[PDB]
Design an enzyme around this catalytic site. Structure first.
Site, PDB file in Angstrom:
ATOM      1  N   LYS B  42      -9.804   4.399   2.468  1.00 15.99           N
ATOM      2  CA  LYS B  42      -9.148   4.660   1.177  1.00 15.99           C
ATOM      3  C   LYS B  42      -7.904   5.556   1.177  1.00 15.99           C
ATOM      4  O   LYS B  42      -7.617   6.225   0.182  1.00 15.99           O
ATOM      5  CB  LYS B  42     -10.166   5.208   0.155  1.00 15.99           C
ATOM      6  CG  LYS B  42     -11.565   4.534   0.157  1.00 15.99           C
ATOM      7  CD  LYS B  42     -11.494   3.001   0.146  1.00 15.99           C
ATOM      8  CE  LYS B  42     -10.868   2.469  -1.145  1.00 15.99           C
ATOM      9  NZ  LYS B  42     -10.599   1.004  -1.083  1.00 15.99           N
ATOM     10  N   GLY B  44      -4.734   4.241   1.906  1.00 14.32           N
ATOM     11  CA  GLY B  44      -3.553   3.401   1.730  1.00 14.32           C
ATOM     12  C   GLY B  44      -3.373   2.340   2.815  1.00 14.32           C
ATOM     13  O   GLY B  44      -2.262   1.840   3.031  1.00 14.32           O
ATOM     14  N   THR B  46      -4.119  -0.889   3.038  1.00 17.44           N
ATOM     15  CA  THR B  46      -3.578  -2.162   2.557  1.00 17.44           C
ATOM     16  C   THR B  46      -2.060  -2.088   2.305  1.00 17.44           C
ATOM     17  O   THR B  46      -1.322  -3.033   2.619  1.00 17.44           O
ATOM     18  CB  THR B  46      -4.323  -2.618   1.251  1.00 17.44           C
ATOM     19  OG1 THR B  46      -5.751  -2.486   1.425  1.00 17.44           O
ATOM     20  CG2 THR B  46      -3.984  -4.075   0.918  1.00 17.44           C
ATOM     21  N   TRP B  47      -1.605  -0.960   1.753  1.00 12.45           N
ATOM     22  CA  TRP B  47      -0.179  -0.740   1.476  1.00 12.45           C
ATOM     23  C   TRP B  47       0.694  -0.758   2.738  1.00 12.45           C
ATOM     24  O   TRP B  47       1.650  -1.524   2.818  1.00 12.45           O
ATOM     25  CB  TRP B  47       0.001   0.598   0.734  1.00 12.45           C
ATOM     26  CG  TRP B  47       1.406   0.869   0.159  1.00 12.45           C
ATOM     27  CD1 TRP B  47       2.481   0.016   0.131  1.00 12.45           C
ATOM     28  CD2 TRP B  47       1.844   2.085  -0.484  1.00 12.45           C
ATOM     29  NE1 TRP B  47       3.555   0.626  -0.492  1.00 12.45           N
ATOM     30  CE2 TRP B  47       3.191   1.892  -0.878  1.00 12.45           C
ATOM     31  CE3 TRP B  47       1.226   3.314  -0.766  1.00 12.45           C
ATOM     32  CZ2 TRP B  47       3.932   2.890  -1.543  1.00 12.45           C
ATOM     33  CZ3 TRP B  47       1.965   4.310  -1.430  1.00 12.45           C
ATOM     34  CH2 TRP B  47       3.301   4.084  -1.807  1.00 12.45           C
ATOM     35  N   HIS B  95     -10.871   1.765  11.341  1.00 11.50           N
ATOM     36  CA  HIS B  95     -11.162   3.054  10.681  1.00 11.50           C
ATOM     37  C   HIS B  95     -11.866   4.002  11.694  1.00 11.50           C
ATOM     38  O   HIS B  95     -12.357   5.065  11.319  1.00 11.50           O
ATOM     39  CB  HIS B  95     -12.092   2.893   9.454  1.00 11.50           C
ATOM     40  CG  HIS B  95     -11.474   2.174   8.287  1.00 11.50           C
ATOM     41  ND1 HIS B  95     -10.222   2.472   7.793  1.00 11.50           N
ATOM     42  CD2 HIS B  95     -11.961   1.181   7.499  1.00 11.50           C
ATOM     43  CE1 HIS B  95      -9.959   1.695   6.755  1.00 11.50           C
ATOM     44  NE2 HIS B  95     -11.000   0.902   6.555  1.00 11.50           N
ATOM     45  N   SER B 125     -11.331   8.050  -4.643  1.00  7.50           N
ATOM     46  CA  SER B 125     -11.181   6.638  -4.314  1.00  7.50           C
ATOM     47  C   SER B 125     -12.394   6.064  -3.563  1.00  7.50           C
ATOM     48  O   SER B 125     -12.796   4.920  -3.815  1.00  7.50           O
ATOM     49  CB  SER B 125      -9.919   6.436  -3.479  1.00  7.50           C
ATOM     50  OG  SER B 125      -9.570   5.068  -3.401  1.00  7.50           O
ATOM     51  N   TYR B 180       0.473   9.347   2.838  1.00 11.34           N
ATOM     52  CA  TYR B 180       0.487   8.524   1.609  1.00 11.34           C
ATOM     53  C   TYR B 180       1.448   9.105   0.558  1.00 11.34           C
ATOM     54  O   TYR B 180       2.218   8.375  -0.067  1.00 11.34           O
ATOM     55  CB  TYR B 180      -0.939   8.444   1.034  1.00 11.34           C
ATOM     56  CG  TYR B 180      -1.102   7.744  -0.316  1.00 11.34           C
ATOM     57  CD1 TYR B 180      -1.351   6.366  -0.392  1.00 11.34           C
ATOM     58  CD2 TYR B 180      -1.039   8.465  -1.512  1.00 11.34           C
ATOM     59  CE1 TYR B 180      -1.530   5.724  -1.635  1.00 11.34           C
ATOM     60  CE2 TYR B 180      -1.219   7.832  -2.760  1.00 11.34           C
ATOM     61  CZ  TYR B 180      -1.461   6.467  -2.813  1.00 11.34           C
ATOM     62  OH  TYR B 180      -1.619   5.851  -4.044  1.00 11.34           O
ATOM     63  N   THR B 214       6.277  -4.452  -2.157  1.00  6.45           N
ATOM     64  CA  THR B 214       5.126  -3.585  -1.927  1.00  6.45           C
ATOM     65  C   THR B 214       4.811  -2.507  -2.989  1.00  6.45           C
ATOM     66  O   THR B 214       4.015  -1.599  -2.736  1.00  6.45           O
ATOM     67  CB  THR B 214       5.207  -2.920  -0.512  1.00  6.45           C
ATOM     68  OG1 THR B 214       6.395  -2.132  -0.415  1.00  6.45           O
ATOM     69  CG2 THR B 214       5.239  -3.987   0.587  1.00  6.45           C
ATOM     70  N   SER B 215       5.408  -2.610  -4.175  1.00  2.87           N
ATOM     71  CA  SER B 215       5.117  -1.647  -5.238  1.00  2.87           C
ATOM     72  C   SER B 215       3.665  -1.850  -5.696  1.00  2.87           C
ATOM     73  O   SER B 215       3.079  -2.907  -5.440  1.00  2.87           O
ATOM     74  CB  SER B 215       6.066  -1.856  -6.421  1.00  2.87           C
ATOM     75  OG  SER B 215       5.759  -3.054  -7.129  1.00  2.87           O
ATOM     76  N   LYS B 245      -5.728   2.800  -9.566  1.00  2.42           N
ATOM     77  CA  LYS B 245      -4.695   3.583 -10.260  1.00  2.42           C
ATOM     78  C   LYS B 245      -3.403   3.723  -9.452  1.00  2.42           C
ATOM     79  O   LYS B 245      -2.305   3.578  -9.997  1.00  2.42           O
ATOM     80  CB  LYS B 245      -5.230   4.977 -10.615  1.00  2.42           C
ATOM     81  CG  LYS B 245      -6.012   5.028 -11.917  1.00  2.42           C
ATOM     82  CD  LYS B 245      -6.527   6.427 -12.199  1.00  2.42           C
ATOM     83  CE  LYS B 245      -7.427   6.429 -13.429  1.00  2.42           C
ATOM     84  NZ  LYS B 245      -7.706   7.801 -13.956  1.00  2.42           N
ATOM     85  N   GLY B 246      -3.535   4.015  -8.160  1.00  2.00           N
ATOM     86  CA  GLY B 246      -2.369   4.158  -7.302  1.00  2.00           C
ATOM     87  C   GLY B 246      -1.495   5.381  -7.555  1.00  2.00           C
ATOM     88  O   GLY B 246      -0.275   5.311  -7.394  1.00  2.00           O
TER      89      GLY B 246
END
Ligand code: A3P
Ligand code: A3P
Lengths: 283, 280
Positions: B42, B44, B46-47, B95, B125, B180, B214-215, B245-246
């Site tokens: 958790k 970031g 994926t980002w 991970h 998260s 992040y 990527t926003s 939420k991001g």
């Protein structure tokens, strides 16, 4: 709700997850040496699949759903049978529950060999009832009788059992499409195994036929993790509710159909199958 | 039950489904040009995964394009198998702490990217993630979950031990360390840095394309990255959405006054001698 999960497609009730991307099935490309194993749900698909696989491997004892892909099975990007088949080396063995009018046309065009298996209607209804209870995303029937009313109407996944059997029986006029019965495998396994070995153009030695009979019995397959479906997540298939290898007998309908319901079912059956020459086994 | 699902493995609490066949991970064979993307859950993942993929390419699901190394669920899901069948150059997601990563990666001197996020925001998260995963027992309350987080009794173990060990490894020029909060406050700089680390030419067009694709808004409506291509039987987004939420600071809406003081005090003791620089 029931009809949120299932929807009618070209006259056949289907799981909406299997029709959202129908184009992928409709345009599937077959190969000349592909072999199709077709059945109406809960008629013994897993049993005859293991028998054929052993034949291909000359009796030499991964999960079965990986060795023999389920053609139309699809759940977004997590499960995809067509993708599995595109990446499988020849000769491929293909599993399906589709009626003739929905099967990819490429299979007919290339005249591929096929095997169709059926089971008596009342015993199929009992087995399918427990299957709906086992699948977590399928709404549980209110009662067995409620389920049977739907079965007679063809309002269950994959549609009418009557229409399915009659259409595939017509197709078996072709010498390359073999028609078989669950009850014949139960009462005379040795004869049925020899017949399959010859249809697949191989030699029925006594040693081979013997290895197959011992490996595919109900007691064996129930303990084989490769064929009993324990390699499939409980989040999807909960065997604590009902095991996949349940009873494996002929006649369990006698423990589920009340007297009044049986008479209505048998009467309805006679009107649907009146002019069909299929020969089911006396039991 | 919590401890029926999770068990300690070589000092790290893990999902038993990922350790039943540990030999497959331990003996994994790496290639010289493999790239490893590592994170504590958790933070970031994926980002930054989507950013790196776009760079490589100058719509299959992201979990198929970039396999999750140790993920395994008998014969239905297998990340190692996916990697053995993937064409080079491969991008690998994990991970795992350094002591558990396949040694072949170190032996071949592969390039790697590590990403972290401030601890209090990670805890919020991760709490919602456990509610989302159907086979993971739901915490009794947020506070109950935080008590476990401070003890390192959550999947993948101690966040403190994870960050400290990977920070030491980043002494190597082939292991890049990122935050992040830096991607949130200065995206253009972080993207240019990644393009250069991967030995490519940063140009006006390339950097801008990645920035808009990527926003948080764009990725929330992209079916390839929002995890809607993954069955609800496993991941139920009706309980909580993946792209939640991001933002920075959601801990202010979850930590009661008394709990925050205890957490921050504990953090001090754990991170005493670590030189890592988080953003103010
Ligand atoms: N080796 C075997 N011998 C007899 N029946 C078998 C068998 N392997 C599977 N079956 C039976 O075939 C049915 C499952 O069919 P399918 O594979 O098409 O889904 C089940 O019926 P029951 O529910 O009556 O026990 C199951 O027990
Ligand atoms: N493009 C993006 N911009 C900002 N936050 C993003 C993002 N993509 C994912 N995230 C956030 O990253 C977290 C998921 O982490 P991971 O990918 O490691 O599982 C979620 O945090 P929140 O739950 O705080 O919203 C999610 O909203």
């Amino acid at each position: 709700e029931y009809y949120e999960v299932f929807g009618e497609f070209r006259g056949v009730l289907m799981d909406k997850r299997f029709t959202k991307y129908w184009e992928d099935v409709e345009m599937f490309l077959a190969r000349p040496d592909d072999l199709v194993i077709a059945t109406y749900p809960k008629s013994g698909t897993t049993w005859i699949s293991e028998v054929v696989y052993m034949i291909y491997k000359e009796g030499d004892v991964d999960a079965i759903f990986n060795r023999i892909p389920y053609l139309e099975c699809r759940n977004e990007d997590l499960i995809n049978g067509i993708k599995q088949l595109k990446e499988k080396e020849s000769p491929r063995i293909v599993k399906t529950h589709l009626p003739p009018k929905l099967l990819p046309a490429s299979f007919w065009e290339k005249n591929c060999k096929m095997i169709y298996l059926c089971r008596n209607a009342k015993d199929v209804a009992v087995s399918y009832y427990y299957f709906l209870l086992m699948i977590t995303s399928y709404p549980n029937p209110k009662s067995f009788s409620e389920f049977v009313e739907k079965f007679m109407q063809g309002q269950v996944p994959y549609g009418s059992w009557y229409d399915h059997v009659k259409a595939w029986w017509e197709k078996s006029k072709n010498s390359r499409v073999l028609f078989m019965f669950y009850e014949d495998m139960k009462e005379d396994i040795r004869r049925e195994v020899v017949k399959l070995i010859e249809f697949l153009e191989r030699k029925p030695s006594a040693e081979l036929v013997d290895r197959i009979i011992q490996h595919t019995s109900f007691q064996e397959m129930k303990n084989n993790p490769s064929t009993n479906y324990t390699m499939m997540p409980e989040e999807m298939m909960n065997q604590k509710v009902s095991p996949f290898m349940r009873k494996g007998i002929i006649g369990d309908w006698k423990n589920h159909f009340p007297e009044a319901l049986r008479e209505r079912f048998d009467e309805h059956y006679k009107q649907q199958m009146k002019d069909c020459t299929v020969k089911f086994r006396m039991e």
